[PDB]
Each structure stands twice: as C-alpha cells, then as structure tokens.
Design a protein around this nucleic acid. Structure first.
Length: 169
RNA sequence: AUCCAGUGGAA
C-alpha cells in the first residue's frame, strides 16, 4: 500500500476480490485463459491481480468477468495499481551486523534510497541485493553506496543486469 | 465493500 496513486494503468492488470479461499491459481487460468495470453496471475490472501499482453485482452476480460461468478460469489473486477519495472543490483558484505533494515538506513543516509532490501543467503553471508525505483539510482548507487565501509564491512553493490520483476507470489 | 506486485522494521 502507498498514498501515491494515479489510476491511469496501461489497461492490463485486473484486480479481483470476492475469492473462495483455495483459488490458488487454479481457475484464473481458466476464466482469464480464453480472454488472452495472460502474462501472469498473482493471487494472494483476499485478492488477485491478473495481467495481459494487450490492453484489449485485459479490458475484454474485465468487461466479461466484472459481472459473473467463479465461486458462487458475484465478481466485480476493476483496474489495478500501475504496473511498473524496477531496478536491482548484486551486493557483497560481511556475515555480521546486517539485515534488510540496516541496508535501508545505510542507503538513505548517503543520498539515494531503496524501495526494497534483501539478504538472500542460507548461512547468512552478509551479502544480499538492493532494489531501486529507476536506473538513475542504480548508476549512482555503484558510486556512492560502493565500498563506503559499512560497520567496518564493505558493500560491493554492482549491477548484474537484473531480471524482470519476480513471477507469482 | 477494494490493491500487490521480493505479501518485511530485526523478519
């Protein structure tokens, strides 16, 4: 959730609400399936967001699904928040004194700011990754957040040419 | 009734 909204989406994401409970990507692929190639469906507790390759396939499905049922409940699909790409980079550090909370405070106390922070490692290696709202923060982070000496450790933030947004929940 | 897109403030 965020206070900044626009409601001027690319006409592709479709927000659903009146789910049963065990929907879990088992009937969206059937209802939204014949409507278009459907890039992805992100169902989660209390709602879902289907997405299409064309503004036409999305509008068509909403026009036909916002007035029927898949769970003995009246559906009322509407347009979702604005689909958007974001940036990410690979970072290295030390297996101590770190959590995604500290990399958020670290990044924001220099000049830049992270939209998300991670420390994906099984044995906790200190290494992780950082997210950015655009490339103009990535190309700066590798010069400002690079090797600044954090807690006596060292941040090796560098661009690995991040993949597209993570698929599904 | 109704908004997440790595379902996060130590998690």
């Amino acid at each position: 959730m965020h206070h900044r909204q626009e409601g001027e989406l690319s006409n592709t994401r479709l927000f659903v609400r009146p789910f049963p409970l065990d929907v879990q990507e088992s009937e969206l692929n059937e209802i939204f399936g014949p409507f278009g190639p459907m890039k992805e469906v992100k169902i989660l507790n209390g709602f879902a967001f289907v997405e299409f390759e064309e503004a036409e396939s999305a509008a068509k499905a909403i026009e036909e699904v916002h007035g029927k049922s898949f769970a003995n409940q009246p559906l009322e699909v509407v347009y979702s928040k604005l689909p958007a790409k974001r940036y990410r980079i690979t970072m290295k550090n030390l297996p101590e004194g770190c959590s995604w909370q500290d990399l958020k405070d670290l990044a924001r106390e220099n000049s830049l700011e992270t939209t998300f922070s991670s420390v994906n490692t099984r044995d906790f290696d200190g290494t992780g990754a950082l997210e950015f709202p655009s490339e103009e923060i990535l190309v700066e982070a590798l010069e400002r957040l690079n090797n600044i000496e954090f807690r006596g450790s060292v941040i090796t933030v560098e661009r690995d040419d991040n993949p597209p947004p993570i698929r599904r929940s």
